[PDB]
Write a protein that binds this DNA or RNA. Structure first.
Lengths: 138, 124
RNA sequence: UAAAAAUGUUCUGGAAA
RNA sequence: UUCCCGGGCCUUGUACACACCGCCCGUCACGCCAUGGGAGCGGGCUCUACCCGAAGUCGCCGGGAGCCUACGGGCAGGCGCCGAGGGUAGGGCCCGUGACUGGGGCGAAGUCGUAACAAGGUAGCUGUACCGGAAGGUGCGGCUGGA
RNA sequence: AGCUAGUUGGUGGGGUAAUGGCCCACCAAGGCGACGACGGGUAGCCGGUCUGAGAGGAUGGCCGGCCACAGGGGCACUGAGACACGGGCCCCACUCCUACGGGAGGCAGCAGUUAGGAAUCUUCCGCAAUGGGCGCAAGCCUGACGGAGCGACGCCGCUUGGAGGAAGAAGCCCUUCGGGGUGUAAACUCCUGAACCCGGGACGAAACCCCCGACGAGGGGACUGACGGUACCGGGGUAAUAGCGCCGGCCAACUCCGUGCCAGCAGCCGCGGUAAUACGGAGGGCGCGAGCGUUACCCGGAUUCACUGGGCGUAAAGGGCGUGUAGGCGGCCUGGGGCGUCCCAUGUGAAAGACCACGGCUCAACCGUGGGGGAGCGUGGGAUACGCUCAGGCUAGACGGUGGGAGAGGGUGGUGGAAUUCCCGGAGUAGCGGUGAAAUGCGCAGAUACCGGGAGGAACGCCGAUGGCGAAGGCAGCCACCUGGUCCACCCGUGACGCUGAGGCGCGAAAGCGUGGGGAGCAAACCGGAUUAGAUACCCGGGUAGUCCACGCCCUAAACGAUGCGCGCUAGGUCUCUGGGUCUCCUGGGGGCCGAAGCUAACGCGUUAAGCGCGCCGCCUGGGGAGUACGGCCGCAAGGC
C-alpha cells in the first residue's frame, strides 16, 4: 500500500543506480516531480519525464554515472553516491532557516519543503525560509 | 526500535551499584575488629593473608584486609576501614588503613611509607 | 532424501609455552 | 591384513590445545557469605470507627448573678459546634529478629561414580511424566544444533 | 490498578481584601484513571555548577530568586501586612527554679559546648563604610555588614639562590676489576639579598551637619578609619625547607642484594615454588612539587539504553499461532481553513556566572566597566510545499461479482482390507522363543509352525515425494454430508473502505488431570533374566497407568526457517506442484537447489533476502545466582504466566 511515496522513490533510484541501470521508473506524484526537478538541476540525474506504464502515470528518471575505470572491477564511479530520507512519517523533521544542515561541507545537498516551494539548502538559506527536511543527497 | 516504541517505552538509565557499602559513601568508616585471623587465598596463589573482621559505625560487620607485613591488631582494636578490595580474599572488600587509631604504621618501611602509616625516619 | 556399526572405569594443585 | 602394537596420507566429529596419560557432570562431607520459608516474637509508618477533649475563633444565651460607659448596647460568665493530644479496638505497608529448614555462590591438592565433549563407547538436546545415592534412566512426542 | 462523601456539580447562605466546597444547609449523582489515577519511596525548585565534540548525563554546597520551617503540635490576638525565629494562649516531651500553690526556657540569629561523625573555625575588633529601624535634628540601636583569627580545604603568586668550579674529591652503588654512575652535584670562588631591623606610612571619607544664598540650585566650612603603625615606600640586610608517588605491560622510569607459592604486591592482565626490571632494602631513574598519594562520589572514555548513534539465523534478543480494541502510521488530482510547520516584528528571557574586549590591585587568582549570545513562551502580521482538517474528483492499495481449479485444511456419520492378540474347531510333536552368548519365560496338562471359523481393539502398506494442505500446532485407506482458507481467468461492481496491533478473545504436539466408556498391539512405574566392581541402565522375559473415544480442564516445547506482519525496489540458471495462454515457451500463485549486485565476524543469505527502503508490534543490554524467591493473577493438581 506503500507508506512513504518519497522514501520509495529515493530508494528506487538508489537501487538501480547501484546496478548501473540506464533509467528507473517510479509512480507519478506532482510533489515527487518537484524533488526530481531539483535532482536534475543540481545535476544528480540526467533528467526525468512523465511517462505511462501500463496505463498509469509514472515518472521515468534517467540516471547519470561517471566514466569507466581501470584495474579489476571497472564499474564506474557514481554520481548519486548517497541519498537518504531524513523526514519520514514515523518521525517528521522540520528545520528553522538557521537550523538548515550543510551537506558534505558543500559538496552535497539537502532538499527542503518550504512555504515557498521545494528548494535546496542554498535556495532555502538565501530565501531565509526553513521547512520539512525531505532528504539529503551527495 | 521504532521511534513510536521509544516514545512509549523509552530508554533506560543504567544505575551503578557500589562495590563498597561503607554507607554515605563515606570516604572511610570507623570500626572494631572482633576477629583478627589469617585466611588462605583464592587459587593460583597460596599464602596466609592477614585479615580482620570489623564491626562498623555504618551498622555493618565486614571483613577487611590489613596491608603490609606484620601488624598489631587484636580482638578489640579500633580501626579505620578504607574500602579497596583484595583479589584473592573472596570475602574482603575493604582495606584497613595503616596508621590510624590502634592500627600501627609499618615498622621499618622505607618505600611508599605514605601508604603504610610508617612516619619518616631521621637519617641519623 | 533413507541411514547400519562399539560390554569395559579413572589420571591430586600450581607452572609449561 | 579382519584383530592386537607403533606409524604414513586423505577425510569426519570435538566442549581437547598442559593437546585422550585431555576435558568434564551431579550428590555426599568440611568452612565462609548473602538469601527464601518458619510457632511466632520487637518495631517504624499508615487507615477507619468510638470515648476523653486543652487554647482558640465562631454561633446561641447573657439569667432569680456581678461592672462599664462614649449604658438602643458592651464586658465578665454559661451552653454548643470544630478541635492538638490522650485512650480502647481493628486493618494496611515496610524494617529488624527466630529454634529449625530450603536451596545458592565462593573455597590448591576429600569421598562415590562417569552423565557430556570423538556412533564419548546406549547419537545428543528437548517439553512432560514416573523412577533412581548421584550424575541420570525409561515412556510419549518434538528437534538436528546426529549418522 | 483501580481511586473518590465535601467526593464532582448546582442554589441560597457564612467567610474573606478577593475568587472558590474555603466552610454550611438543601438538591443532583457526579469526578478521576494505562496520556498511569490511588499508593509506596526518595527529594526543597531555579539562575546555575561539573562533565561532554555535541546531544546528553550528573548535580543544586558558596552567591542570587521563590518556597517552607523556628523543640514536637494546635490556635488566635494586635495589625497595612503575621496565625508572627529572639510576641501571646494551650497540649506534649525534656531540662531547671520553688518558701511545692505556681514559676522558667527553646542557638535552624553570632561566637561557643557536647553528642553523632571519616570530617567542618574565634565565646575577636569596628559601626569607619554600605545597608536598615526610629528621630526635624543631634543621634541611638544594628554578631546585617566591614574586617580580623584558625585550617595547604581550593585557586593564584613567591621562596629554599645565581655565575663560575674537575677527562670528574670523598661516601654510597654497580663492574667483562680497565672502569662506569650519583655529578657541576658538592667542596671551593665571587655575586645577589626571603627573612628580619630603623625611618616614614595610606586609599577606602564625604555628606548628614554648619555658614553665604530661601532649610531649592550652586559654592565654601568642620567632625569621622575597625582593618593598622597593616599594605605600600625609603635605607640597612643573613645562603637562608623538600617532599610525595611511581619505575612488568597498559605507562614515563633498571640494576645489585634479600626472600624462596614464604613474607608480601595487586586498578585490569597477573607477580612469588633458590638467578624475581612485579615482594622488601639499597643505588639509579621518571613524574610532580608545598605538596604529593590514597578512599568515596559525578561525567568521559562506554555508539556499553545508541535522538544525534546499536541491535535480535548461529554471540543476549522474534511473541507458539491467529483474530482484533486503544494507539501509530497512510495512495492519486483539486479547492477552502491555516492547528502542525516556516518567515518578519515585538514583549519577555533580573542580577551574578560563562564567553570576548578593555581596565584596577607590581602579576595572577580575585575585581570593574562595556560588548555579544539565547531558545522557550505571549502578542500582531505573513507564507501554504509537506503533515493536519473540511470538501469534491479518481482507481493503481483493498474488498466484492461471475466463471473455473488443486489439496492428508477442518467437523460429523458410515465403511474396506492386511496384520497382532485372544477363543473355538481341525491336524501335528518336541521344542519354541530370545541374545554377543545366554537365562528367565512359554511347552509333552500338547506350545511353536499349519488350515478353518469367531471376537475385539488400534493404525492405515503400495501410491508416496526432493509432493500437497493449513495462521500455527498439525493433517494420510475409502465414501457421503456440513465447513474454512486459497489460487487462476474476465476486469464486471465499490471507491482508500488500507498496514500494523498494548490489552482482550480464540486456537494451541506430547505428556499430564476430572467423570464415564474402551483396552488388541505398545509401554513409564513395577518383577524377573542376563551384563557388570556395582547396573535402580543399555540387552532379554513379563507389565499398570497411558496410549484409543466422549465432555471438560491443562497452555508447555529444539511450538524451529532457532529468521514477526505488510508493501515497493534490486541479474540470472535449473528442477518441481497447481492455474491461464495467441500450449518452442510465455504468464500467475506455491515448493526446492545454485548463484548478479549487495550484505555478513565468518558460516552463509541472495526476487521464498540475512540485500536496498517505509510503516506498526515483540524482544536484547556480560556470566552465574535464575526462569529461582517474594508478591499478584491463573489451575483440581501437576504447575503456568
Amino acid at each position: 500500500m506503500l507508506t512513504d511515496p518519497i522514501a520509495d522513490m529515493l530508494t528506487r533510484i538508489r537501487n538501480a543506480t547501484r546496478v548501473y541501470k540506464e533509467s528507473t521508473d517510479v509512480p507519478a506524484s506532482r510533489f515527487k516531480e518537484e524533488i526530481l526537478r531539483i535532482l536534475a538541476r543540481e545535476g544528480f540525474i540526467k533528467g526525468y519525464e512523465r511517462v505511462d506504464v501500463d496505463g498509469k502515470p509514472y515518472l521515468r528518471v534517467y540516471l547519470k554515472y561517471g566514466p569507466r575505470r581501470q584495474g579489476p572491477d571497472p564499474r564506474p564511479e557514481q554520481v548519486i553516491h548517497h541519498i537518504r530520507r531524513i523526514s519520514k512519517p514515523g518521525r517528521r523533521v522540520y528545520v528553522g532557516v538557521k537550523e538548515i544542515p550543510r551537506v558534505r561541507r558543500g559538496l552535497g545537498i539537502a532538499i527542503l519543503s518550504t512555504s515557498k516551494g521545494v528548494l535546496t539548502d542554498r535556495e532555502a538559506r538565501k530565501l531565509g525560509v526553513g521547512g520539512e527536511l525531505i532528504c539529503e543527497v551527495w | 526500535p521504532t521511534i513510536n516504541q521509544l516514545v512509549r517505552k523509552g530508554r533506560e538509565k543504567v544505575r551503578k551499584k557500589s562495590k563498597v557499602p561503607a554507607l554515605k559513601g563515606a570516604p572511610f568508616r570507623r570500626g572494631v575488629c572482633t576477629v583478627v585471623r589469617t585466611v588462605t587465598p583464592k587459587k593460583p596463589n597460596s599464602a596466609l593473608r592477614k585479615v580482620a573482621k570489623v564491626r562498623l559505625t555504618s551498622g555493618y560487620e565486614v571483613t577487611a584486609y590489613i596491608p603490609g607485613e606484620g601488624h598489631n591488631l587484636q580482638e578489640h582494636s579500633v580501626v579505620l576501614i578504607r574500602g579497596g578490595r583484595v583479589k584473592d580474599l573472596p570475602g574482603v572488600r575493604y582495606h584497613i588503613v595503616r596508621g590510624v587509631y590502634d592500627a600501627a604504621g609499618v615498622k621499618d618501611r622505607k618505600k611508599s611509607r605514605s601508604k603504610y602509616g610508617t612516619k619518616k625516619p631521621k637519617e641519623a
